[PDB]
Design an enzyme around this catalytic site. Structure first.
Site, PDB file in Angstrom:
ATOM      1  CB  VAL A  27      -0.960   0.025   1.205  1.00  0.00           C
ATOM      2  CG1 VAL A  27      -1.970  -1.109   1.146  1.00  0.00           C
ATOM      3  CG2 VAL A  27      -0.224   0.035   2.535  1.00  0.00           C
ATOM      4  CE1 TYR A  29       0.335   6.756   5.034  1.00  0.00           C
ATOM      5  CE2 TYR A  29       0.143   5.764   2.855  1.00  0.00           C
ATOM      6  CZ  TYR A  29      -0.337   6.633   3.831  1.00  0.00           C
ATOM      7  OH  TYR A  29      -1.480   7.354   3.636  1.00  0.00           O
ATOM      8  CB  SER A  31       8.598  -1.763   4.047  1.00  0.00           C
ATOM      9  OG  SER A  31       9.679  -1.479   3.189  1.00  0.00           O
ATOM     10  CG  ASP A 159       3.918  11.097  13.629  1.00  0.00           C
ATOM     11  OD1 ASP A 159       4.314  10.950  12.449  1.00  0.00           O
ATOM     12  OD2 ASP A 159       4.275  12.015  14.375  1.00  0.00           O
TER      13      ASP A 159
HETATM   14  C1  LIG Z   1       9.584   7.553  14.806  1.00  0.00           C
HETATM   15  C2  LIG Z   1       8.155   7.489  15.279  1.00  0.00           C
HETATM   16  C3  LIG Z   1       7.857   7.296  16.617  1.00  0.00           C
HETATM   17  C4  LIG Z   1       6.548   7.212  17.057  1.00  0.00           C
HETATM   18  C5  LIG Z   1       5.498   7.319  16.151  1.00  0.00           C
HETATM   19  N1  LIG Z   1       4.136   7.275  16.609  1.00  0.00           N
HETATM   20  N2  LIG Z   1       3.750   8.135  17.612  1.00  0.00           N
HETATM   21  C6  LIG Z   1       2.449   7.905  17.762  1.00  0.00           C
HETATM   22  C7  LIG Z   1       1.642   8.644  18.812  1.00  0.00           C
HETATM   23  C8  LIG Z   1       0.898   7.631  19.696  1.00  0.00           C
HETATM   24  C9  LIG Z   1       2.556   9.514  19.668  1.00  0.00           C
HETATM   25  C10 LIG Z   1       0.633   9.550  18.127  1.00  0.00           C
HETATM   26  C11 LIG Z   1       1.991   6.931  16.882  1.00  0.00           C
HETATM   27  C12 LIG Z   1       3.081   6.543  16.158  1.00  0.00           C
HETATM   28  N3  LIG Z   1       3.188   5.737  14.993  1.00  0.00           N
HETATM   29  C13 LIG Z   1       2.070   5.444  14.256  1.00  0.00           C
HETATM   30  O1  LIG Z   1       1.037   6.107  14.352  1.00  0.00           O
HETATM   31  C14 LIG Z   1       2.167   4.332  13.266  1.00  0.00           C
HETATM   32  C15 LIG Z   1       2.941   3.188  13.416  1.00  0.00           C
HETATM   33  C16 LIG Z   1       2.795   2.122  12.546  1.00  0.00           C
HETATM   34  C17 LIG Z   1       1.864   2.165  11.509  1.00  0.00           C
HETATM   35  C18 LIG Z   1       1.697   1.000  10.568  1.00  0.00           C
HETATM   36  N4  LIG Z   1       0.534   1.120   9.693  1.00  0.00           N
HETATM   37  C19 LIG Z   1       0.577   1.795   8.539  1.00  0.00           C
HETATM   38  O2  LIG Z   1       1.616   2.270   8.078  1.00  0.00           O
HETATM   39  C20 LIG Z   1      -0.705   1.946   7.812  1.00  0.00           C
HETATM   40  C21 LIG Z   1      -2.036   1.661   8.155  1.00  0.00           C
HETATM   41  N5  LIG Z   1      -2.884   1.998   7.197  1.00  0.00           N
HETATM   42  N6  LIG Z   1      -2.089   2.515   6.197  1.00  0.00           N
HETATM   43  C22 LIG Z   1      -2.693   2.947   4.981  1.00  0.00           C
HETATM   44  C23 LIG Z   1      -3.476   2.059   4.244  1.00  0.00           C
HETATM   45  C24 LIG Z   1      -3.870   2.393   2.955  1.00  0.00           C
HETATM   46  C25 LIG Z   1      -3.509   3.609   2.407  1.00  0.00           C
HETATM   47  C26 LIG Z   1      -2.771   4.515   3.159  1.00  0.00           C
HETATM   48  C27 LIG Z   1      -2.361   4.191   4.450  1.00  0.00           C
HETATM   49  C28 LIG Z   1      -0.778   2.499   6.534  1.00  0.00           C
HETATM   50  N7  LIG Z   1       0.205   2.963   5.729  1.00  0.00           N
HETATM   51  C29 LIG Z   1       1.112   3.318  11.347  1.00  0.00           C
HETATM   52  C30 LIG Z   1       1.269   4.393  12.194  1.00  0.00           C
HETATM   53  C31 LIG Z   1       5.782   7.508  14.811  1.00  0.00           C
HETATM   54  C32 LIG Z   1       7.099   7.597  14.386  1.00  0.00           C
END
Ligand SMILES: Cc1ccc(-n2nc(C(C)(C)C)cc2NC(=O)c2ccc(CNC(=O)c3cnn(-c4ccccc4)c3N)cc2)cc1
Length: 331
Positions: A27, A29, A31, A159
Site C-alpha cells: 500500500v 509510508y 514498507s 503519526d
Molecule cells: C519515529 C516514530 C515514533 C513514534 C510514532 N508514533 N507516535 C504515535 C503517537 C501515539 C505519539 C501519536 C503513533 C506513532 N506511529 C504510528 O502512528 C504508526 C505506526 C505504525 C503504523 C503501521 N501502519 C501503517 O503504516 C498503515 C495503516 N494503514 N495505512 C494505509 C493504508 C492504505 C492507504 C494509506 C495508508 C498504513 N500505511 C502506522 C502508524 C511515529 C514515528
C-alpha cells in the site's frame, strides 16, 4: 508456542510473517502491506521497520515508537494489534514488524462539513490529545494526514512519521517556553480549515508562515514580551507583524460563534495562556458530546529512556524485550 513464518519477496523487499497473516499486498509510508488476519477475519496493515538497528538514532527511534504504540489504549489513538520478529533469539534479532488497523482514509481524504461534524471530529482529537498529554507525551506533528477517519466520522490520532501550516509559532521562532499546547495550536489550525474549507496559514516557508500567523493573532502583548530574554528576538517578532492586521470575526464569517470563541482560545501566541485539551473538552462548543465520565487519562508512561545515551546493542536488547513481552489487545 512460536508461530510458523513464511517468506516472500515484494517491492524487492523480503517479508517474513506468521501464517495467520495471508494475502499481503503493498500500500502507498515505507514498507507497508495490507494483510488478511485469519485469526479475526479482519484486514490489517503490517509494517516492516526499515534498518531498525542501523545506527544509535534509528535503534532509539525503533524502541521509542514500540514503547509509545504499546502504551496507547484509547478509542481516539492508534492501537498496536501485534508486533513480531522471525528471530528465534536476541542473537538473530534484526527485523521488527508492527501490525495496526488498516487506515487508508485521512482527514483530507474525507473533506464541506456541517457544524455537527466539525464538533464531533475536533471533540475526538481533543479527547485523544487529553489522553496522550496526560502521559507527558507531545505529538508535535498534528495535521490532517496524521488523523485516520472511517465512514462514521470516527477519528484516531497517529503519526505516519506541510507540517509548517499546523506548527506552533514558538517552535518556528525558537522561543525557550515549549509545552504540550504546541498540539492545541495545531488543533486550532485543523478546526479553522474544517470550518472554512481552506488552510488558515498556508505559508510558503517559516518566515511567510509566521507573518501570516501574526497578521491574525497580532504582535505579542506586553505580558508575552516580558518572557522573551533577547532584544534581537523581541525586535524580530515585532519585525514580522507588519501585514495589515486581520480580525477573527471576518476570517470565520458564518462559523458557529462558539467555534470562533474556542479558536480564539487555541490560536494564542502566548503558550502559557493557550487552552489545554482537558479545558477545550469543557468548552460550550462541545456541549452535545462532552462527558466528563468518558474522557479518560493514560496510565503512567515510563519516559526515563528518552534522556539516555546507550549503545546500539542496548537499544536492540530493550526493543527485543518489548517484542517478547507484548500482549495482544482482546479479539
Ligand atoms: C519515529 C516514530 C515514533 C513514534 C510514532 N508514533 N507516535 C504515535 C503517537 C501515539 C505519539 C501519536 C503513533 C506513532 N506511529 C504510528 O502512528 C504508526 C505506526 C505504525 C503504523 C503501521 N501502519 C501503517 O503504516 C498503515 C495503516 N494503514 N495505512 C494505509 C493504508 C492504505 C492507504 C494509506 C495508508 C498504513 N500505511 C502506522 C502508524 C511515529 C514515528
Amino acid at each position: 508456542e512460536r508461530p510458523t513464518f513464511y517468506r516472500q519477496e515484494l517491492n524487492k523487499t523480503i517479508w517474513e510473517v506468521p501464517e495467520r497473516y495471508q494475502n499481503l499486498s503493498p500500500v502507498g509510508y515505507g514498507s507497508v502491506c495490507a494483510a488478511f488476519d485469519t485469526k479475526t477475519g479482519h484486514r490489517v496493515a503490517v509494517k516492516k521497520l526499515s534498518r531498525p538497528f542501523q545506527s544509535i538514532i534509528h535503534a532509539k527511534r525503533t524502541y521509542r515508537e514500540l514503547r509509545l504504540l504499546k502504551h496507547m489504549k484509547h478509542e481516539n489513538v492508534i492501537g498496536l494489534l501485534d508486533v513480531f520478529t522471525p528471530a528465534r533469539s536476541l542473537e538473530e534479532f534484526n527485523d521488527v514488524y508492527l501490525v495496526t488497523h488498516l487506515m487508508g482514509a485521512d482527514l483530507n481524504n474525507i473533506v464541506k462539513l456541517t457544524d455537527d461534524h466539525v464538533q464531533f471530529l475536533i471533540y475526538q482529537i481533543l479527547r485523544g490529545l487529553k489522553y496522550i498529554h496526560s502521559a507527558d507525551i507531545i505529538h508535535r506533528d498534528l495535521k490532517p494526514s496524521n488523523l485516520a477517519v472511517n465512514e462514521d466520522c470516527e477519528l484516531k490520532i497517529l503519526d505516519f512519521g506541510a507540517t509548517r501550516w499546523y506548527r506552533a509559532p514558538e517552535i518556528m521562532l525558537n522561543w525557550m517556553h515549549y509545552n504540550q499546547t504546541v498540539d492545541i495550536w495545531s488543533v486550532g489550525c485543523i478546526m479553522a480549515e474544517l470550518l472554512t474549507g481552506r488552510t488558515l496559514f498556508p505559508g510558503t516557508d517559516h518566515i511567510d508562515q509566521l507573518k501570516l500567523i501574526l497578521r491574525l493573532v497580532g504582535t505579542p502583548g506586553a505580558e508575552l514580551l516580558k518572557k522573551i530574554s533577547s532584544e534581537s528576538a523581541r525586535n524580530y517578532i515585532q519585525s514580522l507583524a507588519q501585514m495589515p492586521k486581520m480580525n477573527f470575526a471576518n476570517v470565520f464569517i458564518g462559523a458557529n460563534p462558539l467555534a470562533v470563541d474556542l479558536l480564539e482560545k487555541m490560536l494564542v501566541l502566548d503558550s502559557d495562556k493557550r487552552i489545554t485539551a482537558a479545558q477545550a473538552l469543557a468548552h460550550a462548543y462541545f456541549a452535545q458530546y462532552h462527558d466528563p465520565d468518558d474522557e479518560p487519562v493514560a496510565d503512567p508512561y515510563d519516559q526515563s529512556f528518552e534522556s539516555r545515551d546507550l549503545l546500539i546493542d542496548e537499544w536492540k536488547s530493550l526493543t527485543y524485550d518489548e517484542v517478547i513481552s507484548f500482549v495482544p489487545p482482546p479479539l
